[PDB]
Ligand binder design. Sequence first.
Ligand SMILES: CCC(O)(O)CCCCC[C@H](NC(=O)C1CN(C)C1)c1[nH]c(-c2ccccc2)nc1C(N)=O
Ligand SMILES: [Ca+2]
Ligand SMILES: [Ca+2]
Ligand SMILES: [Zn+2]
Length: 368
Amino acid sequence: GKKKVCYYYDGDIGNYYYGQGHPMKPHRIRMTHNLLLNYGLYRKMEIYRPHKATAEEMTKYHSDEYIKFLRSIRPDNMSEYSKQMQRFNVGEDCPVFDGLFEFCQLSTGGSVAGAVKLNRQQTDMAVNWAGGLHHAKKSEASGFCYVNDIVLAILELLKYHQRVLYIDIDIHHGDGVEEAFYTTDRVMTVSFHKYGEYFPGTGDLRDIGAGKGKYYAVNFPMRDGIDDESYGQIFKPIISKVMEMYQPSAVVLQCGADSLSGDRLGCFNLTVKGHAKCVEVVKTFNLPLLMLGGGGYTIRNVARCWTYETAVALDCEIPNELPYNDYFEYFGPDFKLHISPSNMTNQNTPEYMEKIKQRLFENLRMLP
Ligand SMILES: CCC(O)(O)CCCCC[C@H](NC(=O)C1CN(C)C1)c1[nH]c(-c2ccccc2)nc1C(N)=O
Ligand SMILES: [Ca+2]
Ligand SMILES: [Ca+2]
Ligand SMILES: [Zn+2]
């Protein structure tokens, strides 16, 4: 039935600024929080302010040198770190900004705190919209991500769970998470993403894991314009088969909103209902679940998406008419929660979707 939901948020998160022209806007997390507060969704959730994760907590995955660099670099001293900036991939996508380290600490803190709460069996679901930064690597920043809060949260879950399932619905391949666990069977990573002349360039159908991890990495490559009907028809069957064969005891779901119609960087055509159907599907399995953020670059739609997904987690129905809020004008000209898909062509034919699903089903038959 209805579950207990713990939500992690720091009121300072919206003030971190990647810089002029950078599409990643932490302010979208504050818009989400304010919208969900004005819908009354605070009355049913336990709200927590995450601790600032320590460099030590971060080094459970990342190298000591990379975390020391992140904790030391600032816009005023960048000139003295040109060598380490190249080595750790700090540049246009992952710039140095005021409070970069604290932003990483808050993003990571929410994910790890949520994982601890799930481990202690004190909540059914934990939500951290500031997390889900799936591209960060052991000693390298990538694609707007510096510290891989997801990998850290999964390592925390692995203390009490033999098998953890990771599902990623961001439009970009979940490469950092896939790479971290590529050679183990204790985590199964499942990513649905645009593949072909698109960042990060990984996530081929044929990337299925290695060694003990062979068959424990699943990739569903898609083309432009996927819609609710098409996504829905493959998501539930794949996740159901993964649940059946893998039998995970905890799940982490990355809810990157750049898979929505009208995203500034994305090329998919999902509505908020289509995206949220993934949360409904996963929630139905009644397993401890950590829901995380990720991409999303048309910020009014990211706030709508994550507000609706928080309502889905709470089994609370909320009206389509948006309540008045601090950012009301951002939701014009309609001031509604739900969005309409565009007229873009769906290049994922029904036959292509079935064929890729059948290839993934063949790989899933190889599990013990
Ligand atoms: C938070 C999780 C997430 O998966 O959503 C993150 C998505 C990251 C997208 C990164 C992308 N970067 C690249 O394509 C760079 C150029 N190539 C040599 C690598 C990129 N960087 C930028 C960019 C634009 C302006 C200023 C800075 C970066 N745009 C793009 C783009 N359109 O793909
Ligand atoms: Ca993905
Ligand atoms: Ca794996
Ligand atoms: Zn993305």
